[PDB]
RNA sequence: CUAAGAAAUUCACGGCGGGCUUGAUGUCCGCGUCUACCUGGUUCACUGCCGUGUAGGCAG
């Protein structure tokens, strides 16, 4: 995508960037649900992978009549307060490129104990036996917290930032802005 | 290069029999505990779906 748009969280005494960044990243979410699409990508320039840290700032990508549909929109209303805004700006030359990709471990033995159970209609202890305790997966990766509306939970999603590539390819982006194929300008 | 250098304690055994500890008793007067703070600190790692799959993803 040809156009960026970056977003600094303002920084708060009242808040840490964590909650911020994480409703910036749900009400994003809510936006892109509302717009649809599959062309709007997400990235982090201030990631620190020594420390798992997403850092302070947002850059968006999409064409220009998007960002500036996106910026009038209420999706941003009651929270302009808590972030400072930029421009649509074209993406400077040259850049590497990478990908937004969401990371999910299977850190809980007791959904696999679950789905196991469910669709083979086994007993507690053969899925005991059939899975360990071990199956348990570390993630080092940075993560946000958001919350379901519907039928409400918080949940962390882990978000990786791949290897520097040269040149993009077509793909697509999810509604919540992470990479299906497509990759975004890394600057 | 050490008041260095060295060393086999050990065999066996019946402690028990008996007993009244008692009477008596006033704890007690008195007391200012106060003042002021964001339990959230991503830390609620969930719920379901596609997939034979535990391999891999998805949706909120």
Known sequence: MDHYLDIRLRPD???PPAQ????????????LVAQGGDRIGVSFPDLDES???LGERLRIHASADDLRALLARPWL?????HLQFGEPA??????????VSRVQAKSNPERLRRRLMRR???SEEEARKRIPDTVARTLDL??????????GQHFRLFIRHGPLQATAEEGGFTCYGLSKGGFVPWF
């Open 90 to 99: 074209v993406v400077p030359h040259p850049t590497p490129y990478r990908q």
């Open 51 to 53: 420390r798992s840290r």
């Open 142 to 151: 940075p993560f946000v917290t958001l919350r379901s509306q519907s039928t």
């Open 13 to 15: 005494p009242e808040f």
């Open 20 to 31: 911020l960044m994480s409703v910036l990243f749900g009400k994003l979410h809510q936006a």
């Open 77 to 81: 209303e009651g929270l302009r307060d």
């Open 120 to 122: 083979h209609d086994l």
